[PDB]
Amino acid sequence: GSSGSSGQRNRTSFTQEQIEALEKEFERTHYPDVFARERLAAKIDLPEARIQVWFSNRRAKWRREEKLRNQRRQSGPSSG
C-alpha cells in the first residue's frame, strides 16, 4: 500500500449503553471474576463470554497507554 494508518476504528459491536457499564467495572477490576462477569451480564444484557473479550482487548489498550504516561512523566518539577 501507499498511504495507510495505525489504530483506526472501522466498526463497533457493543453499545455505548453496554460500554459505560463495562468501563465502570474495568476501572475497578481488570479481571472481573465469575461473580462480576455474571452480575454484569444482566447489567448490560451481554453473554459472560462477551465480557471476557471486551475486557481482554482493554488490557492491551491500558497496558499500552499506561506506558505512554510513564515515558512522559517528568521527575523534575516542571515549573514556569
Curated annotation (Swiss-Prot):
DNA-binding region: 8-66
Coiled-coil annotated residue ranges, if any: none
PTM: Ubiquitinated by TRIM11, leading to ubiquitination and proteasomal degradation.
Stated consequence of mutating F55S: In MCOPCB12 and COLON; significant impairment of transcriptional activation ability
Subcellular location: Nucleus
Source superkingdom: Eukaryota
Medical condition linked: Aniridia 1: A congenital, bilateral, panocular disorder characterized by complete absence of the iris or extreme iris hypoplasia. Aniridia is not just an isolated defect in iris development but it is associated with macular and optic nerve hypoplasia, cataract, corneal changes, nystagmus. Visual acuity is generally low but is unrelated to the degree of iris hypoplasia. Glaucoma is a secondary problem causing additional visual loss over time. Anterior segment dysgenesis 5: A form of anterior segment dysgenesis, a group of defects affecting anterior structures of the eye including cornea, iris, lens, trabecular meshwork, and Schlemm canal. Anterior segment dysgeneses result from abnormal migration or differentiation of the neural crest derived mesenchymal cells that give rise to components of the anterior chamber during eye development.
Oligomeric and partner information: Interacts with MAF and MAFB. Interacts with TRIM11; this interaction leads to ubiquitination and proteasomal degradation, as well as inhibition of transactivation, possibly in part by preventing PAX6 binding to consensus DNA sequences. Interacts with TLE6/GRG6.
Family: Belongs to the paired homeobox family.
Task performed by this protein: Transcription factor with important functions in the development of the eye, nose, central nervous system and pancreas. Required for the differentiation of pancreatic islet alpha cells. Competes with PAX4 in binding to a common element in the glucagon, insulin and somatostatin promoters. Regulates specification of the ventral neuron subtypes by establishing the correct progenitor domains. Acts as a transcriptional repressor of NFATC1-mediated gene expression.
Protein name, entry field: Paired box protein Pax-6
Organism per entry: Homo sapiens (Human)
